[PDB]
Amino acid sequence: MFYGTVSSPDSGVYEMKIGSIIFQVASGDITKEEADVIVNSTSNSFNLKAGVSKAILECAGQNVERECSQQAQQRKNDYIITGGGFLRCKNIIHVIGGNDVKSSVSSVLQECEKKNYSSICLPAIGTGNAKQHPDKVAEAIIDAIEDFVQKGSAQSVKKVKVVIFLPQVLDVFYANMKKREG
Template sequence: MDAAGSQVAYECAQYAGQYQNGFITTQGGNLLCSKIIHLITDNQVKSQVSKVLHECERRMYKSVAFPAIGTGQAGLSSAKVADEMLDAIVEFARQKSVQHLQAVKIVIFQTNMLTDFYESMKKREDSDSSTIESWLSMFKSFFWGRKQSSEKKKSTIFEKKVNLVTFQICGESQEKVDETESWIKDLILKEQFESIISDEAIENFDETQFAILEDLQRRKQVNIEILNKLSPPQIKIFGISRDVCSVSLEVQEMVHQIKSTEEEQSKADLLYNLVEWRYLGSNDSFVAFDKLTNMQLEHAKMAKKPYLNVRIKKKNYKVDLNTLRATDDQGKTKILQRVTKDEGK
């Protein structure tokens, strides 16, 4: 109150007893803010924070800064206060009606409280990482800034929206502040991990694979970069260690599927040079199956299978490999033909 100045003290005295919803609002006085919201302590931290946030939104304020409410004369534990304050902030941020309030700051004066607030945020990440942006990622963006998209040819960095949370660190001396900042950075770095996957198949990723990678980056606490300029091409995944590991496994499976598809297509191309399967079309002329279906039919025949299910013009058919007839779900049949290439067409 002393720092705010006598005018603020006068307003508080003037409005005493007139407060509604547990707070009164005064001018900012000598402080670097436009307004000060004074809370009437009732030990209901979550409720008070929620009321202030909604009041800020109603008044179209763009930012608000909180102290660790209730940890002073009220004597509440900093761990309990951290949980309740962050519960209120997260619930408020989830509301689609929020349009004006863009930044919420928590000002912590005691170094020991940082651990409680950090642990509270970490619990939220562990329990609901799919719906709440990683608090650690937010810390990282505060200290090191957001990652800019690379413009290098043939390299792709998927855009990732990172919400920004600012912690203002106050201490008895600059040395104490620097120590606390260093401690937070060390915590962040311990959570970081990087994985690099190198394979020629990455060069054949198309829009389908890119969409999957973008979705993985959106859902997980990772950043993904594709380096097609390198030989062999690489996919670099970096972020929270547990998510990096799970995303790496999914990317490796994608690479495996690409390689398997390419291998199958190569086999189908070779076989198509030797034998061709056809079906009788609507104009009484035979039409060649696609190369993969051609290979499936040939393999089924070589394995002496009696039947094989195929698709002809987006309809399902059951092929009798003994009679070379295909029957659809309505009982209609098509005649099939197997021609070796040395027989001619």
């Protein structure tokens, strides 16, 4: 009841509508992206610096690293929201890579509506240090967006883009989109 047609609007970018949201995938360097929110896939201590989390914390800077540890030593967090530092975003949302990916993406969507944000960029959450399988991760990300549209919750959010480090993982996401297409 929600899916549009899969097409390529720009070289290396693939998209489809999911209700009112445009869902996009591409391979590349997530630290070069501009969006209201960029998502970091990290550990339960919010201080992983390996793979995509290394690139995100290095680019963002030490004030963001200090924000993460300051919040981590205050309460038990499922995820944390910090400033963007020297990334091109308004906030970073740091999610735990080993957690249920559908739950993590649902939380990101809800927090973006609370701030009236329109754009999100995320990596293939859980496929790095957490070693979750790429088709399970693709299925979970897209299912979270579908549920969000189905509940009537999308109002400010208009664009969700996954920027994926390994081209082989992009191929898995594209196949999942084609399975769903309207």
